[PDB]
Amino acid sequence: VVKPTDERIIDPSTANTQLTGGVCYNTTSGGNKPLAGSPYGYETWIDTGGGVCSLCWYGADQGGGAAFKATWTNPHDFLGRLGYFWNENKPYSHYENIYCGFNYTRSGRKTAGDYSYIGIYGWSRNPSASNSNERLIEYYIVEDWFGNQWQADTSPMGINTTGGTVMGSFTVDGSSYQIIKNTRVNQPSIEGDKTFVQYFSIRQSPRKSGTISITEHFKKWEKLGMKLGDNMYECKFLIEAGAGEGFFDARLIQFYRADNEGNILQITPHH
């Protein structure tokens, strides 16, 4: 696979200008909500029993088009996410090579509760799987987190946070990633309360900027027998905060897709 060199790709390492003029959402969105003049959709999950949370999109024309800020004040499992919404009966391979360039600031260690996640997130459906537990999949590519009282945010989370079993590992985008499979038994899902599986890639060296070669994770999961099936739901940049008081503020979130030759299939956004 040839890495894309298209000049519309924004270098994540130096994409660190603070953005302004967000459009903010302060309540649960009830699923994916499309964004005007954008290929992306956002979703918020904001427990009304917790404190104030928000997700603010920075619009279609700056920060790579999927940039957002989120804030939380003592949430109960806040999730804010923005990116591709699919749900069109297509396996991951249909979308070819998916990349996300990112750069953000965030609050420090212990500002997001006992567990937290930053990176790529979605679901996929695999109804023909023989194991009924494996017919619905929730997935995470975890670039970073906020640590907690017990563990530094510079230390990667593991199965003590995620649950489940270490299946293997591989190296991509400058770090080893540990691959974890967890079964969620009779838990809330996009299909109601049920048993489903979670796939994780945990970045061993956490970071706040770079490029995620998303499709490389999907390929390695599938090689380990962690199948995604044939109806990818979404592929979004996520901040999840279990609790705490904090923020996440992206200067860049740029999704793009390219074929194996490295030619752009999809990207956002005279002298």
Largest sheet: 10 strands, mixed
User: Domains counted in the coordinates: how many?
Assistant: 1
**Rg, please?**
17 Å
What is the straight-line distance between the termini?
A: 33 Å
Number of DSSP-assigned strands: 17
Secondary-structure class:
mainly beta
Shape annotation: globular
Q: Could you state the order of secondary-structure elements as H and E? A: EEEEEEEEEHEEEEHEEEE
Percentage beta strand: over 45%
Tally the helices: 2
Helix content: under 10%
Note down, in words, how this protein is organized.
The chain has 271 residues and is mainly beta. The chain has one domain. Helix content is 5%, strand content 45%. Strand 16 and strand 17 form a beta hairpin. The longest helix has 10 residues, at 214-223.
Relevant terms:
monomer; 271 residues; ten-stranded mixed beta sheet; 45% strand; globular; hydrolase
How do the strands and helices of this protein lay out in sequence?
Blueprint: E1 23-25, E2 33-34, E3 40-45, E4 53-57, E5 68-73, E6 78-85, E7 97-106, E8 116-125, E9 136-144, H1 159-162, E10 165-172, E11 175-187, E12 194-203, E13 209-213, H2 214-223, E14 231-232, E15 234-241, E16 245-258, E17 264-267
PDB class: hydrolase
Keywords: 4-beta-xylanase, hydrolase
Assembly: monomeric
